[PDB]
Design an enzyme around this catalytic site. Structure first.
Site, short mmCIF file in Angstrom:
data_model
loop_
_atom_site.label_atom_id
_atom_site.label_comp_id
_atom_site.label_asym_id
_atom_site.label_seq_id
_atom_site.Cartn_x
_atom_site.Cartn_y
_atom_site.Cartn_z
N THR A 1 31.39 -51.81 84.37
CA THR A 1 30.31 -52.82 84.87
C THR A 1 31.38 -53.94 85.65
O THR A 1 32.58 -53.96 85.64
CB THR A 1 30.07 -53.68 83.62
OG1 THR A 1 31.16 -54.05 82.76
CG2 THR A 1 28.96 -52.84 82.97
N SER B 1 32.05 -62.75 85.26
CA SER B 1 31.36 -62.30 86.51
C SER B 1 32.28 -62.23 87.57
O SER B 1 32.75 -62.99 88.03
CB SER B 1 30.11 -63.09 86.96
OG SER B 1 29.53 -62.51 88.07
N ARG B 2 32.40 -60.68 88.12
CA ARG B 2 33.43 -60.55 89.41
C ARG B 2 32.56 -60.97 90.58
O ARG B 2 33.37 -61.10 91.62
CB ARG B 2 33.81 -59.43 89.46
CG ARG B 2 34.94 -58.93 88.64
CD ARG B 2 35.98 -57.85 88.78
NE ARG B 2 35.29 -56.44 88.38
CZ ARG B 2 35.44 -55.89 87.42
NH1 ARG B 2 35.66 -56.43 86.22
NH2 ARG B 2 34.54 -54.78 87.15
N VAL B 3 31.44 -60.80 90.70
CA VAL B 3 30.52 -61.41 91.89
C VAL B 3 30.62 -63.03 91.88
O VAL B 3 30.98 -63.52 92.75
CB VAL B 3 29.13 -61.07 91.77
CG1 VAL B 3 28.39 -61.68 92.85
CG2 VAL B 3 29.01 -59.59 91.89
#
Ligand SMILES: Nc1ncnc2c1ncn2[C@@H]1O[C@H](COP(=O)(O)OP(=O)(O)O)[C@@H](O)[C@H]1O
Ligand SMILES: Nc1ncnc2c1ncn2[C@@H]1O[C@H](COP(=O)(O)OP(=O)(O)O)[C@@H](O)[C@H]1O
Ligand code: BEF
Ligand SMILES: [Mg+2]
Ligand SMILES: [Mg+2]
Lengths: 467, 54, 487, 466, 170, 85, 156
Positions: free
Chosen positions: C323, C349-351
């Site tokens: 994920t 959250s990598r976004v």
């Protein structure tokens, strides 16, 4: 059709059939035996051979011995004539009172109720037990689970529930003893004759009893929970009735499955369990349920091997429950009984819109003060009580009172506590804890809160202690 | 004279306890990982032995 | 004909061994004499290992098994909305057949590297802790992970409920269709769930796919692929879907049952070596399509249950690396009153920012920093008498921001509501308000602005951010209200 | 020659051949399929059957379906045409820009360079990044463990290395994404195009990309690091270059190998890893070295399972590492780019017998002062930065100028920032730091040393602030 | 034989840890695949069918009894392990002994909070009930409070009294 | 050869940890039962029979010797582990 | 481990040696609390031997339970009664060390053999507080109690 025994290894018997093969789940009857020996078909091996699990001991079996296919799964007596009676796995009477003369029989294997048959109705079932009612209350028609390691209090709790809720319940009860102590089954049977819940004389018996205890081989222990659940299904459906189902202990259905798994040719899953652990549990548990046709309040004691709640067996059981009571040996060890973990017991109905914002806000406040204490414990155990602010140590004194006020002497536990049993109404439970949380008893000593019913008994006790 | 001696001592003693806790943390983390690895291995060897015995 | 048909050699535990079917393809759906379906997972020299979709009391040695021309596919389209279906798309809610015109295979490759664009459009959950600190974008895979009863399903349900505010509106771009995949759950739990979605009027834009505890292992395995295919109807037609897999833990268990009984070799925790593959191929199917491909999306929110916090266990490890980010829930936060119980230090959250609006981005950035600096010091809280005023300030701003992240269940907030609330804390207005009064404050403050300042809110939204004018207007709303609150 | 499938069990396919057997490691081509399905031979089971691992889904396969022994291992396009392109594990292009037009193919399995082919000399590989070169210098043909992870400028640093190696060494690059998240592979492609290191227009690309994406079977993810390696071998062997190989990430190479081992029915070893863990790693890593013709240098991102450095996977990896580059979030939040931890990153070749006796003492001197600055940091938030002695005030002032002097504007980040890119020569890096230590810049302000290249820009920037 | 003939017998199985090991050997040599901890899957049942036979008979069956004291050996004090909890989950109580208690001079070295009887006062004479009825719970609370009190910091008369009573009962 | 001909040799096994890992690889591929750390029961004998060969011979057998310096790599200072011990 | 665990039942006396104790330089490295003997019975060894043995083990177990606090906070946080058991316990630990003839190369001390009566007396005296004034290190690597006293005087 007639078959012949070709292999016997413990509880697992292979049978060859010349003609037609009995389908899986069929009950076979072994000939040449003094008491009924049923084999349940588990597998078709090939070459006209079936693999079966036995429902009683296989000592004395001989290769070549004759086995008859009964045409159906194990079928048991259901209906009002089971009330006041004791049955084993295959529905024979074991109370020495002759035949169970019912009109109908039911197979112990059946499909679980469909999704459209589900009910969402949920209202509180008050028990009189302070910790349960306050922090994780049961629901009528809900699924209740009592988790704990060996000897921490599951059975005592379930006997208190039976005492507090079943003794004056309107409809019917089923108690299934599954892989537990025969002594306990005898205790219970006579306690219920004495209380009139069972009546050996008339027809006002309100409880049916099914037993397959730890002196029974694993095939019996693996099926007997189905026998009891079948009795309860009939009451739920064919009388549309309100049913209480008690199981002690549902783990023993899973454990019995694991005993025979290797002999059934399975590769073991993690921790030595059958690879089908969750589906086996699913097809059994999904029958234990309220429907639109009728309600079942089920209470299941759930053994926790090696005190490890992550054990595959207990871990897989959690998702089948609407309310859980988790017992802890670390708590029992302290004399806190019932040994319920206030920070690991939960209820689907612990919602302010269901129990009201006052019950909920108190419940959550009690848990907060216990979590805060839990997180202080080890620190002050080293740096000392003095380093705390006069408010950090306020929640220390209060939390320790609350930990003690969650204890409670059970009627059914008098032989152990030496205290008379107490039943505490919901309003009083709430008020009691409300009051300690609000500071109302900062002046009373910790011990005054240990092992009493209502909050007035703690004020009483404080005066008694003064000298 | 007293608080100079007290706050010096407390500073020192609390320095030592901090360093002692830090060493114990290191040692317990090591023990943790050794136990962690052995649990995985033991659990696997059980599965293998069962599979093999069939 | 032993090319198109076979005979059962042995049957037990959901696995049928079949002599023949010489022409079956790997993973093809076959049919038993009784009517049961089965799927051909093991093609062996002298037998086919068939995984049974049902109760095997209906299958005996000698039973005829046939290839039928079958394809493992599901109904797809908007006729599924508001419907509750099983793992193969059959209606189980009792409301008649699905009016489906289209169908789609459950096993399909994810869009490759080229047809995608960066993840940029917010997927608003309505949860302050997530929307600000762990922001999710359209086409992201964000894990909800934690022990039992920590609030995982609740994040998902709140998320689904939140979408009404977009799905009722007029801007087609912001709309989001929801897919809830229930795997290995009990039926009454799923009933309570759809009840909750019905009373919230969220069911009309939600598909519920349900493979419950008494459904056969193969059905629980398939269910998340079926639901994924339904979401791909939306991803590939310029629309946006959200899928929740609740949970992938139970799907993996059901897969392991099948593997072990087909006698494939056991690895860690008795899982087969392709269990990583099982989930990676599921979760890559979530994507943000580029304009050439329709601009559509499928966001995934898989759920994993840990056991005693062990995020390094086998399956959690797998889904964590697959994920784009993780929301970590903790029991201890839960009972301390941090509900939702999100570990804001660990969650990621990598976004990140790319999936936040300008107004949220502004205040969330300040909150993050101030909470990080709080965490450094949070143990001097109950052991701090003579801390320097600078660090009493960190402690105070910190406990207050923490209270603002607390949020009731079943009430997702619009983004501009969330920034109004966060603004109040990150601008210092709550620094003298006793920490236990904060949630009373917030509930009251927000009713007020929602009541009397729909225009300030309409504008915080419209300007993308907080203008100088909004700043002044907020300053006076907050000071005066606070003064009133503490009177 | 042509075989028939006799067993399909997931990612494992058994193929029977009527005549001569495909030897272990041969690529087999499955016939009758939309897209190319390749099977790698793993064992000869006897009775003319081989057991194979699949590089893609096996759904649809039929017993009796025809399979073609290709006569070799997996062979992939190699040469300057792989640059700026994306291929998968079996060498197929996946960027959609048509075929890859090379004269040469290469087999992905190849034994390591022999003992006689080994350079006996240990050379620094100058990156032109001050922090690296001074304190934890890369070794020519060595392996570098990149820590930190996502968030701290790994991608910028990677792209800068491609840039500075194709620039100051005339060496190209390969990027092997082992278990690449599809979304992140797209993202990476476009970042590289936007920074220049890939170019769709001409033929000036500096990197080939090789992706083995998470959604592929374990055989595929297990082999991609080798595909990536083969590509790189061309530029070292055939073109004589000092090449750069990026493996993102090495744990996922171990993991895929563990998966393949499980599927082949091999008994797991300690902690669940493959029995072949050390040799799996060895036969791949040994190919990365300096030969007489050239060198491959590898930067490998390491995931440490459970933050446990004694876990078999990281422990097996560390035996092959000549340096670590530790990217740190603490440093990033202090605005020092690149966010390299100058005390946590290490080099094996940081030795007076390998690098300068002058290089070594400058780096050791930088270390001691930065370590000494850390000691004094408790005596600052207590007594204030004045109660210090003249000796102790001097090391604070010099250390802070050193910290800032370790920062560097990158060419690869000219778009996002605005500053012009710097590539600092090794002798200038050594000189710069030697003089801040000496005190030949104590009269200069602290922020004169921040985001500059050589020490000559510290003078130019200190004047422009006057 | 005593049980079924109106007589009373006591049996000690010393010890069932070594019995389980022997069962395990036999089972593995018979090639029955091992379960948890290499023991067979049915190691609970080995002891459960044994210990169920200790029983009190009603007067119609002659009024006799068989009482059992099985012995289990733990490793490193771990009562919470698999084989130990298996057996605890069979019996009507356990007496847990600890080396730490033993060496401190608590002999018999019984851990009170962790030991239990599942028959309780019903197996005591009234005289023993009159003096011992609440002692077990009291002594569990005593040990907890002794620990919390560990550092002698301003304690009320009630806890001071519990401490005084506790140490003397010990 | 040296030890047996009145000469003195010195041998370094660098390292025996890696050799044991090699042997465990081989033993597990042979499906031998894994024990502590998944090592076969004969991992002790592997090293014992090897290191016994380092000896000091008396004058009657030439007076020669083989001296052995095996190398073992510990993980994080753990000298109590199975191969080290 | 199965091997040693199974062996315990075969012995009348067990001497359990500890690496932890060895690394402190206590030789022989016998764990005083893990070594047992079937004849440690007052009817076999007599009551004086039995009582001194049990007293030593009690003080050592008492000391062992105080060692969690010692490790974090140190000696200073202990009460005066606990400081006493600590200092007597540490003296007893060292008095249990002994130079072996066989180990002279490693100790740098001549080997000692101590008659049982002198063993009982020595520990009886330490327990009774007769040597609270002497330093710890005087009890290390000696034969009879007299040697630790002479050693004490020598340490000036
Ligand atoms: N509520 C209680 N009050 C007092 N003692 C209890 C209570 N519950 C359990 N105990 C003690 O623990 C023993 C074991 O409890 P029980 O319920 O039989 O354990 P299990 O959890 O194994 O069924 C009891 O017989 C009693 O001695
Ligand atoms: N934000 C919240 N505030 C208060 N209670 C919550 C919140 N979120 C969840 N809960 C409660 O916590 C319990 C567990 O939530 P649930 O979503 O079922 O967790 P999980 O899916 O992890 O088991 C439920 O009773 C739920 O109502
Ligand atoms: F021993 Be208990 F009944 F689990
Ligand atoms: Mg019980
Ligand atoms: Mg849930």
């Amino acid at each position: 059709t007639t078959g012949r025994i070709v292999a016997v290894i413990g509880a697992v018997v292979d049978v060859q059939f010349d003609e037609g093969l009995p389908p899986i789940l069929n009950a076979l009857e072994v000939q040449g035996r003094e008491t009924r020996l049923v084999l349940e078909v588990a597998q078709h091996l090939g070459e006209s051979t079936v693999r079966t699990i036995a429902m009683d001991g296989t000592e004395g079996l001989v290769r070549g011995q004759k086995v008859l296919d009964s045409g159906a799964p194990i079928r048991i007596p259901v209906g009002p004539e089971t009330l006041g009676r004791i049955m084993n796995v295959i529905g024979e009477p074991i109370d020495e009172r002759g035949p169970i003369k019912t009109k109908q029989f039911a197979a112990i294997h059946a499909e679980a109720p469909e999704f459209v048959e589900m009910s969402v109705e949920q209202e509180i079932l008050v028990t009189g037990i302070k910790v349960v009612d306050l922090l994780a209350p049961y629901a009528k028609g809900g699924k209740i689970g009592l988790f704990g390691g060996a000897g921490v209090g599951k059975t005592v709790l379930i006997m208190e529930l039976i005492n507090n809720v079943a003794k004056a319940h309107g409809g019917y009860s089923v108690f299934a003893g599954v892989g537990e102590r025969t002594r306990e089954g005898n205790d219970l049977y006579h306690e219920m004759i004495e209380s009139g819940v069972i009546n050996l004389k008339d027809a006002t018996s309100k409880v049916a009893l099914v037993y397959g205890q730890m002196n029974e081989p694993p095939g019996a222990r693996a099926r007997v929970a189905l026998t009891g659940l079948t009795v309860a299904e009939y009451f739920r459906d064919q009388e549309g009735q309100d049913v209480l189902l008690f199981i002690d202990n549902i783990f023993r259905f899973t454990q019995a499955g694991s005993e025979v798994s290797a002999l059934l040719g399975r590769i073991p899953s993690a921790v030595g369990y059958q690879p089908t652990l969750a589906t086996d549990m699913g097809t059994m548990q999904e029958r234990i349920t309220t429907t639109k046709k009728g309600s079942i309040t089920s209470v299941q004691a759930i053994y926790v091997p090696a005190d490890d709640l992550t054990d595959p067996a207990p871990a897989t059981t959690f998702a089948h429950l609407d309310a859980t009571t988790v017992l802890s040996r670390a708590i029992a060890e302290l004399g806190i009984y019932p040994a319920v973990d206030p920070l690991d017991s939960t209820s689907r109905i612990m919602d302010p819109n269901i129990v009201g914002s006052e019950h909920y806000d108190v419940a959550r406040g009690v848990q907060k003060i216990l979590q805060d204490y839990k997180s202080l414990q080890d620190i002050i155990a080293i740096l000392g009580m003095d380093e705390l602010s006069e408010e950090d140590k306020l929640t220390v004194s209060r939390a320790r009172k609350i930990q003690r006020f969650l204890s409670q002497p059970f009627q059914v536990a008098e032989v152990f506590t030496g205290h008379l049993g107490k039943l505490v109404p919901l309003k009083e439970t709430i008020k009691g804890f409300q009051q300690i949380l609000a500071g109302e008893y900062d002046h009373l000593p910790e011990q005054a809160f240990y092992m009493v019913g209502p909050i007035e008994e703690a004020v009483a006790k404080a005066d008694k202690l003064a000298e | 004279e007293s608080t100079t001696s007290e706050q010096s001592a407390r500073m020192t003693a609390m320095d030592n306890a901090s360093k002692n806790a830090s060493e114990m943390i290191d040692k317990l983390t090591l023990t943790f990982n050794r136990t962690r690895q052995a649990v995985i291995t033991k659990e696997l060897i059980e599965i293998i032995s069962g599979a093999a015995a069939l | 004909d032993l090319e198109e048909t076979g005979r059962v050699l042995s049957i037990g535990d959901g696995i049928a061994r079949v002599h023949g079917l010489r022409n079956v393809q790997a993973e093809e759906m076959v049919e038993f004499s009784s009517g049961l379906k089965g799927m051909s997972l093991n093609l062996e020299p002298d037998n086919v290992g068939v995984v049974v979709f049902g109760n095997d009391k209906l299958i005996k040695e000698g039973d005829i098994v046939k290839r039928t021309g079958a394809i493992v596919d599901v109904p797809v389209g908007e006729e599924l909305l508001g419907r509750v279906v099983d793992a193969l798309g059959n209606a189980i809610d009792g409301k008649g057949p699905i009016g489906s015109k289209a169908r789609r295979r459950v096993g399909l490759k994810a869009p490759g590297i080229i047809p995608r664009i960066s993840v940029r459009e917010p997927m608003q959950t309505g949860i302050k802790a997530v929307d600000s600190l762990v922001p999710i974008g359209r086409g992201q895979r964000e894990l909800i992970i934690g022990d039992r009863q920590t609030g995982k399903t609740s994040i998902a349900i709140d998320t689904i409920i939140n979408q009404k505010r977009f799905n009722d509106g007029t801007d087609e771009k912001k709309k989001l269709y929801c897919i809830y995949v229930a795997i290995g759950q009990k039926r009454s739990t799923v009933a309570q769930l759809v009840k909750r979605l019905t009373d919230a009027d969220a069911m009309k834009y939600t598909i519920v796919v349900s493979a419950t505890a008494s459904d056969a292992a193969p059905l629980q395995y398939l269910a998340p692929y079926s639901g994924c295919s339904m979401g791909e109807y939306f991803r590939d037609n310029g629309k946006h879907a959200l899928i929740i897999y609740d949970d992938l833990s139970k799907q993996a268990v059901a897969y392991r049952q099948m593997s072990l009984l087909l006698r494939r070799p056991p690895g860690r925790e008795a899982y087969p070596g392709d269990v990583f593959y099982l989930h990676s191929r599921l979760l890559e199917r979530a994507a943000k399509m580029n304009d050439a491909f329709g601009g559509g999306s499928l966001t995934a929110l898989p759920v994993i249950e840990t056991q005693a916090g062990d995020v390094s266990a086998y399956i959690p490890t797998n889904v964590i690396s697959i994920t784009d980010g993780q929301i970590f829930l903790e029991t201890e936060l839960f009972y301390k009153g941090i509900r939702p119980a999100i570990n804001v230090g660990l969650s990621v959250s990598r976004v990140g920012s790319a999936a936040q609006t300008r107004a949220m981005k502004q205040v969330a950035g300040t909150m993050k920093l101030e909470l990080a600096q709080y965490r450094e010091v949070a143990a001097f809280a109950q052991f701090g008498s003579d801390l320097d005023a600078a660090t009493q300030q960190l402690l105070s701003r910190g406990v207050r921001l923490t209270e603002l992240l607390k949020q009731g269940q079943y009430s997702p907030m619009a983004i501009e509501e969330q920034v109004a609330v966060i603004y109040a804390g990150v601008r210092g207005y709550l620094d003298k308000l006793e920490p236990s009064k904060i949630t009373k404050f917030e509930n009251a403050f927000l009713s007020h602005v929602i009541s009397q300042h729909q225009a300030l809110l309409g504008k915080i939204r419209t300007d993308g951010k907080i203008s100088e004018e909004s700043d002044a207007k907020l300053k006076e709303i907050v000071t005066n209200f606070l003064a009133g609150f503490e009177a």
